[PDB]
Amino acid sequence: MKGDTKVINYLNKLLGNELVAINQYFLHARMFKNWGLKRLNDVEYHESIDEMKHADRYIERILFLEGLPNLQDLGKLNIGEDVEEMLRSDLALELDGAKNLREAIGYADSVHDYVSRDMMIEILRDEEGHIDWLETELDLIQKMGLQNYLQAQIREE
Amino acid sequence: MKGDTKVINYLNKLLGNELVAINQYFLHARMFKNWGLKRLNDVEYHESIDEMKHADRYIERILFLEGLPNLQDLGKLNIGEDVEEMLRSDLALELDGAKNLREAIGYADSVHDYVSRDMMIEILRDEEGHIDWLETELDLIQKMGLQNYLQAQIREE
Amino acid sequence: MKGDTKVINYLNKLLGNELVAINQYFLHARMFKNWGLKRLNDVEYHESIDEMKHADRYIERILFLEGLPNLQDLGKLNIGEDVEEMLRSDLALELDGAKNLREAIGYADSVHDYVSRDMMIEILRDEEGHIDWLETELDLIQKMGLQNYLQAQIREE
Amino acid sequence: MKGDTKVINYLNKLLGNELVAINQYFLHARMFKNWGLKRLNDVEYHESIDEMKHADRYIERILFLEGLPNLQDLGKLNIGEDVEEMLRSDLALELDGAKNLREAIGYADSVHDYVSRDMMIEILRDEEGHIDWLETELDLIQKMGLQNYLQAQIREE
Amino acid sequence: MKGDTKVINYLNKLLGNELVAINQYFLHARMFKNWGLKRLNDVEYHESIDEMKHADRYIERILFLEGLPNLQDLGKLNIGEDVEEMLRSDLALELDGAKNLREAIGYADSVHDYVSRDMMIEILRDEEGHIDWLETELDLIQKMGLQNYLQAQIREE
Amino acid sequence: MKGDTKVINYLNKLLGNELVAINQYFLHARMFKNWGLKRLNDVEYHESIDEMKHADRYIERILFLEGLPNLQDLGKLNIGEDVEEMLRSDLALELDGAKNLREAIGYADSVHDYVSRDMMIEILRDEEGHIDWLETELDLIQKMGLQNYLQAQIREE
Amino acid sequence: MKGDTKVINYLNKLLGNELVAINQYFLHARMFKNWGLKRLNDVEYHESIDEMKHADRYIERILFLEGLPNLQDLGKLNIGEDVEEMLRSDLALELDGAKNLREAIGYADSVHDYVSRDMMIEILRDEEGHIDWLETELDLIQKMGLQNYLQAQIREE
């Protein structure tokens, strides 16, 4: 069913954000794991899987609308070297991605692609869940100090 | 069955205390939860449900005695901004509520309303349990310091 | 994540509505229970719990958006003295709340808060559910008479 | 297997009767449901399903006999606006449809289409069950009065 | 609850669309079954049931909003005589229904009927899934040829 | 119970039809099995068992009516040498037997042997079932070609 | 534990190969799924998961050896527009990655990194299995024709 060409462009843009976040959150998780921070490995691994499922939804919707999914261009990752920098970089990526989502949701409504809009609002709700987690962990680092925070990451939850 | 006018006034006063405590302990719980202090969310949530059950008991006892439960007037909440301030706020509210309970329990005995007295003594025993938990947490904050105390709240118990 | 000031204001207004409805539907339920109308007690009790769940959603959303939930201001309850008057007061309260909800849904869309909007639409569906039950019970009273209606409330459904 | 042209015409006429009944029964059931008359919704919904199954049998038998099922021409519904008017309209529709069935059964026998005759007789047995229930409900309304009758419909049976 | 007049007209127009598709997809299913194409009978039967469930949702919504569901005016079926023509005809019907849905969803938003809007978006998501299936089957016919395609329909999946 | 002489004659005529079909179906089944067309073996074998059960019913009815079942005279089998010729021969046989069944059914009715008539109508329904399957398979051969059709018979269903 | 710089460079080059393969096989799978070729979607999806597991192993090995996994540079995908072209593209990518693997396995032996060598031989056995499946499917297309091949992909195996 042929979709609106700009909707497809947005979906490819948002797919590009997911591709970045898949890789950044997967590398972060295994860096946490190598450091023995098991609680952080588990959550970041999960977040990477969530982004993978978001990418799947975009790819399928692009194909249904008769566009070409763009998995070739990968935007810039910002890996970071310590726990706090890694989480802050993940939050920055989510905040930028949420901005792109809100723009695309309003456009899809304007051209009456209400199914694409509904799918994106569901994805946005997941992203705001990630933002909440990231902000909350960052606040805990500053409330209990980095050393107490790291001790709390050794065991799985 | 027509109850004593002053007993009903006490029951409406005690109900008004429970109404304040429902709202205050529920908001504190969700604040702790937003900060990632799952252990404190769990306890405060269950204290809120306790006050909800006490409120029910007062409402039904007032209606049985042919009075009008007053759920319109809501006393002053003291929310607070940090963990220790919130816990001290809840403790002050329980201690004030306990004095009101002691006064009503003695008066109910004076007019031979022994069923209301027995109901209130059960509620007072519950409140002294909250007091115990609150005082003990405030002491733990002093003995181990706030940073260690907050680390101990990240996971559920 | 910082929210829109007016959206937070709307969420606090909608929360204020839920607080009125919690108290009014809970008291109505126990009045029905004291009169031995178990069927009406059960439904009104479950409507009250449902409003409690809506309040919880507003509180957690306001907090994530970094606002202050207002559980201190409590609007006017209209309790009523007979069955039909109580149901009509509950209906009027739901209708006012649905008006406020429609206004906040339109506005959350205007500022691209699509998650708050999606949350509120789910709540509006619950309220329309309550409206339908209330209207239908009021029609049954006119169609079968109050006496037959009351007789049908004695047993649980 | 090529059937008799007139038998196919009769099956299409009866299929038309069923299509009217499917819609009228279904709308009546949801009107009963909206009014809180749960007992009547349950029965009328299941009568609708019965007519649906009858329509399927007509459709498959016309196709087997190499005719064209006519689902395009919908006859006249008579909805009605109160309970008794709705039940009497269903009864009239059934009585008309049983008259048509008797004609078709006799014709199918005279052209030796004994399988189509046997199918129609089983369908007529179902319609006669529907006539029985409808006549009985209408008598009950007269014997106990509309108000008592409506009270009896509130709960599912 | 008194709904908006033009929303009710939209809901009745969309209900009409579903009524057409109920009949067309059921007749096509039994045609396929009579030809021994069991796989096509199974899908088209469950598309019919899907449209029946949508029509139920429109009827209940209209009644809640105090409108009159219109099950009397049946639009034009286009049945067709071979497999490709029947699938193309189902696809044409779905695309016309989706156009009507987009228009209605826009309007319901403008009058703040967000529950009706949310209902329609869910139905639209179902229709776009049907469009996907139909387009894919029609492509398979071209890619593998009609004879190979028909052979693959003989067994249930 | 002494039955009508001409009914017994018809029952023996119908029994004779079944004896031919039993042998013809069974041989065709095992020819299909020998060719590796397992799907056709399964169906034809079960058509054979079905005619055996019809034969058994004729034999018991005749004996009850105090006639002599005739298993001695075996009408003409037409075996055929390729799949399509075999299916056409079965279809011709069934169509001839349905003709006799209609004749017998009309006569049993005229002599008031309603139990024999009812028995025959149940058997006629079974035969029209076989006719339907045979016609459909012959149509599938035409629509997909013999080569594709034979490939679809290799595996059991 | 400090790894050999050139081993880490090989591990990062092989990880790059898997990253291309993850994206190409996931997109190919969803294209097959959108075309209704469920058997091809299922295999290609599971090939993508295989390459994801391979990437996880390279990432963890590199981190252990104290190097930096490179998830930022994405090599060239070659998507293609029809089944045979897509399968041939996957086969070419696998054969390139198998050459790189042979080169890295030989070098890890030379520097005595036997654990990395062992890891890579396991990955090589997996890739050789993929090569086998791809070559086999491409041969089946030639032997039976594309139309017959496509028909065989419609149902899941």
Ligand code: ZNH
């Ligand atoms: C890009 C694009 C992409 C996409 C779309 C995806 C998607 C995906 C999906 C859908 C899944 C399933 C999950 C669930 O459960 O649901 C997965 C899994 C997955 N994954 Zn991934 N991915 C990807 C990439 C990736 C990468 C790049 C990596 C590495 C780095 C990965 C690693 C992974 C893992 C490990 C897993 C799991 C596996 C198993 O199964 O175990 N991955 N994934």
Ligand code: ZNH
């Ligand atoms: C005021 C008055 C009042 C009263 C009387 C009450 C009471 C009550 C009761 C009885 C219950 C049940 C539980 C148990 O038991 O377990 C409840 C639940 C409850 N609740 Zn609530 N509430 C109230 C208010 C409230 C509020 C205001 C809120 C918010 C804020 C709440 C929230 C709640 C919740 C969340 C819950 C749970 C529910 C469920 O189940 O889920 N709530 N509560």
Ligand code: ZNH
């Ligand atoms: C017309 C033509 C027609 C036909 C033939 C039919 C048929 C039918 C059948 C066969 C079935 C199944 C049954 C049983 O199994 O029990 C049904 C179901 C049915 N259906 Zn329907 N339909 C119809 C129409 C219809 C309409 C129009 C509607 C609406 C109004 C409906 C609604 C319905 C429902 C709701 C159901 C149930 C569904 C389910 O599955 O859940 N429907 N359906």
Ligand code: NA
């Ligand atoms: Na009465």
Ligand SMILES: [Zn+2]
């Ligand atoms: Zn995501």
Ligand SMILES: [Zn+2]
């Ligand atoms: Zn309490």
Ligand SMILES: [Zn+2]
């Ligand atoms: Zn609510």
Ligand SMILES: [Zn+2]
């Ligand atoms: Zn019927």
Ligand SMILES: [Zn+2]
């Ligand atoms: Zn539909």
Ligand SMILES: [Zn+2]
């Ligand atoms: Zn037979």
Ligand SMILES: [Zn+2]
């Ligand atoms: Zn690989």
